[PDB]
Amino acid sequence: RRRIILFPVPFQGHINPILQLANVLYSKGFSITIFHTNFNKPKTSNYPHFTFRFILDNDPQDERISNLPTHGPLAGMRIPIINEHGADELRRELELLMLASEEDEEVSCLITDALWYFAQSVADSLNLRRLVLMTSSLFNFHAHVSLPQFDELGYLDPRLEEQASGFPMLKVKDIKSAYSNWQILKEILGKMIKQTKASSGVIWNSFKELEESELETVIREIPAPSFLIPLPKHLTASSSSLLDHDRTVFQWLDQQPPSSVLYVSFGSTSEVDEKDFLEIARGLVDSKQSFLWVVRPGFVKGSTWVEPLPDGFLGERGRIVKWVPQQEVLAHGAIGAFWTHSGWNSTLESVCEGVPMIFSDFGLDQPLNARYMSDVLKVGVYLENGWERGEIANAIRRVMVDEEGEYIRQNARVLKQKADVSLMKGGSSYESLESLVSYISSL
Ligand SMILES: C[C@@H]1C[C@@]23CC[C@H]4[C@@](C)(CCC[C@@]4(C)C(=O)O)[C@@H]2CC[C@]1(O[C@@H]1O[C@H](CO)[C@@H](O)[C@@H](O[C@@H]2O[C@@H](CO)[C@@H](O)[C@@H](O)[C@@H]2O)[C@H]1O[C@H]1O[C@@H](CO)[C@H](O)[C@H](O)[C@@H]1O)C3
Ligand SMILES: O=c1ccn([C@@H]2O[C@H](COP(=O)(O)OP(=O)(O)O)[C@@H](O)[C@H]2O)c(=O)[nH]1
Numbered sequence: 001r002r003r004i005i006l007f008p009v010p011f012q013g014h015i016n017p018i019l020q021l022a023n024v025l026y027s028k029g030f031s032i033t034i035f036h037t038n039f040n041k042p043k044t045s046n047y048p049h050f051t052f053r054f055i056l057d058n059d060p061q062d063e064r065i066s067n068l069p070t071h072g073p074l075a076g077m078r079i080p081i082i083n084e085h086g087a088d089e090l091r092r093e094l095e096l097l098m099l100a101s102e103e104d105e106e107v108s109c110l111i112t113d114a115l116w117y118f119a120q121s122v123a124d125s126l127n128l129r130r131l132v133l134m135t136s137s138l139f140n141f142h143a144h145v146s147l148p149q150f151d152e153l154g155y156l157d158p159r160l161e162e163q164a165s166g167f168p169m170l171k172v173k174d175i176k177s178a179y180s181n182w183q184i185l186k187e188i189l190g191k192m193i194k195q196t197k198a199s200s201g202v203i204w205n206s207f208k209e210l211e212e213s214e215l216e217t218v219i220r221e222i223p224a225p226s227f228l229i230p231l232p233k234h235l236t237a238s239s240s241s242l243l244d245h246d247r248t249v250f251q252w253l254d255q256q257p258p259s260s261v262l263y264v265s266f267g268s269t270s271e272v273d274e275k276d277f278l279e280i281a282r283g284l285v286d287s288k289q290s291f292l293w294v295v296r297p298g299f300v301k302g303s304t305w306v307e308p309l310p311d312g313f314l315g316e317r318g319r320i321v322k323w324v325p326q327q328e329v330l331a332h333g334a335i336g337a338f339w340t341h342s343g344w345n346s347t348l349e350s351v352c353e354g355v356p357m358i359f360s361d362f363g364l365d366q367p368l369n370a371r372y373m374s375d376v377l378k379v380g381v382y383l384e385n386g387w388e389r390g391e392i393a394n395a396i397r398r399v400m401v402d403e404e405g406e407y408i409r410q411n412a413r414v415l416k417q418k419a420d421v422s423l424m425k426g427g428s429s430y431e432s433l434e435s436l437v438s439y440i441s442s443l
Contacts, residue, residue, distance in 0.1 A: 001106075002029075002031070002105070002106055002440075003030065003101070003106070003107050004032055004107075004108055004109060004110075004111060005034075005035060005110045005111070006021065006032070006034055006133075007090075007110065007111070008112075008113055009079060009113040009115050009135075010036060010037045010039050012241075012268035012269075013269075013345050017135050017231050017345060018034075018133055018135075019034070019047070019237065019239070020205075020231035020232070020235055020240075021111065022050065023234070024229070024231070025437075028437045030440075033050070033051045033052075034050055034051070035090075035093060037055065037056050038057045039057055040070075042239075055093050056086050057078075062085070065081055065082075072298075075269075079188075082118070083115075083118040084118070087121065091125060091126065094110070094126055098128075107128065108129075108441065109200065110123050110130045111133055112132060112133070113133055113135065114192050114202075117191045117192050117194070118195075119195075120198055120199060129200040131199060131200055131201040131202070132199045132201070133205070134196075136365045137204075137344055137365065137368070137372070138217070138228075139211060139213075139369075139372045141218065142218075143170070143175070143178065144189055145193065146167060147179070147186075147189070149166060151182075155176065155179075156182050158176070159172045160173045161173065169372065169376060170368065170371055171371070174367045174368060174371050177361065177367040178364065178366075181363075197222055197223065197224070199224050201224045201226070201439065202226045203227045204218075204229070205230065205344070205345075206348070207229070207230040207428060208422065209419075209421075210230070210415070210418075211228075225439060227432040227435065228428065228429060228432050229429055230419055230422065231348075232345075232348055236325065236328055238325040238328060241325070242268075243296075244323065245324060246322060250328075250329075252319060253332045253334040253335075259400070260290050260400075261290045261291065261292055261336055262284070262290065262291040262396055263329055263335050263339070263355075264293040264294065265324075265339075266294075266296075266340070266360065266362070267341045270296075271299055271300070271301055272301065273301055274303065276387045277299070277300045277303075277309075279387040279388065279392075281314075282389040282392075283389040283390075283391075283393050284314075284392070285313070286390070287393040287400075288317070288393075289336075289400055290317045291317065292318075292321065293314075293319070294321055294323060294326075295320050305322070326346065326349060327353065330349055330353040335353075335355055336400045337356050337358060337396070338355045338356070339358040339396070340357050341362055342361045342366040342369040343366060344365060350412075351373075351412070351419065354416030355412060357373060357379060357380030357412075358383060358396060358399055359373065359374055359380050359381065367384075377415060378408060380412075381399055381405075
């Protein structure tokens with residue numbers, strides 16, 4: 001028997017695909033151990049078939065992460081901090097596990113988030129193969145490796161509406177938004193790319209017919225074999241949710257006509273002004289469409305939840321909730337469209353459920369996802385110029401009601417079908433998974 005160790009980054013958009021992958025590999029006969037921080041841990045009782053080992057932030061907590069806040073932008077500093085100081089502990093934990101292994105059981109490989117670049121040298125030092133799971137798109141990676149030219153052309157220094165050079169898919173504004181925090185980002189992205197290239201293999205949460213134009217960059221830039229597997233088509237991430245589900249939404253969805261509901265969610269970490277939260281509310285009401293709006297407590301700066309919102313302002317058409325099983329909501333027949341912040345997991349879930357999108361973005365890979373989905377695949381409409389009630393309502397009605405938006409709704413249905421076909425015998429994702437399992441088994 002063969003065991004796989006997976007090591008996720010402890011945030012919702014990173015824990016979800018890694019535990020989806022773990023379940024896919026378990027279904028192929030591998031045993032599974034998950035290394036995880038105590039911070040943002042998932043419910044281990046949801047995974048009785050996995051062994052969990054909590055590392056790196058056991059108390060006594062290191063002076064470096066002990067004081068760090070658990071929410072907000074600062075919470076993510078754990079990532080560079082662990083990258084720079086976690087190697088010795090990670091090596092100890094891997095050796096302990098390999099020493100306690102049964103005789104009929106070998107550890108085939110370690111799979112980490114690509115952001116754990118420090119894990120490559122640890123795994124090398126144990127003669128352990130490391131595979132990398134990319135939680136962002138191939139298009140995003142193509143932009144990463146093109147950063148030399150970007151800085152060179154002056155894109156990275158504060159021409160906004162012009163097509164970027166040798167990247168006609170993007171506007172300069174997209175690059176400026178995506179790489180706005182350069183000094184801090186440049187080092188992380190450089191190290192992540194370098195150690196991804198040195199890995200034994202790269203698993204992408206995508207499928208070939210989604211990102212066909214980007215396959216050549218990956219083959220040329222990454223010498224290790226790449227595997228494209230659309231995880232949401234195998235299973236939802238419901239079991240790895242870090243917050244409790246409000247499942248009362250399904251009884252409400254069951255009262256809505258098919259394709260009549262706009263689902264609205266801006267992810268697991270974004271936050272907005274009070275000024276913008278109220279403009280978003282006014283756009284929603286102005287569209288005259290039914291909506292289900294997930295608002296994380298903490299989404300609005302300066303309020304605990306939605307205190308700025310007058311009582312009854314959503315009316316008959318709208319409901320606001322703290323958190324849902326998102327892919328299961330997207331699969332419900334009532335859903336007509338998805339207003340997303342363009343996180344990659346949300347984007348791919350909406351594609352795999354065939355739901356057209358309205359795109360906003362909060363930086364990082366989000367503006368690139370929004371531009372690729374709206375202009376290359378044409379499965380949504382991109383609100384690329386702030387929050388304005390009038391523009392919001394027009395975008396919503398264009399995707400959900402206007403005859404002019406029919407091609408977008410049709411494109412989303414066709415793309416879902418292409419994803420389903422990729423999982424059949426002979427399809428691209430079926431063959432990638434088949435190859436991934438035989439590759440891991442040969443290690
Ligand atoms: C590893 C990065 C370093 C860091 C932490 C510190 C830093 C930064 C945030 C930037 C500046 C402020 C500061 C200080 C501050 O934390 O607020 C600075 C950038 C980002 C850092 O990682 C981010 O940590 C967030 C939690 O704080 C997560 O929610 C992650 O992302 C979430 O899930 C994804 C699904 O794959 C996305 O789809 C994404 O939409 C979604 O937000 C991850 O985003 C992406 O960063 C992309 C930037 O290029 C990468 O390409 C990766 O692919 C990576 O996925 C955190
Ligand atoms: O109410 C919600 C909102 C989102 N999610 C899940 O949280 C993840 C968000 O990841 P994404 O990459 O889209 O954005 P991030 O939060 O990392 O910015 C996705 O898997 C969603 O299905 C959820 O389960 N319920």
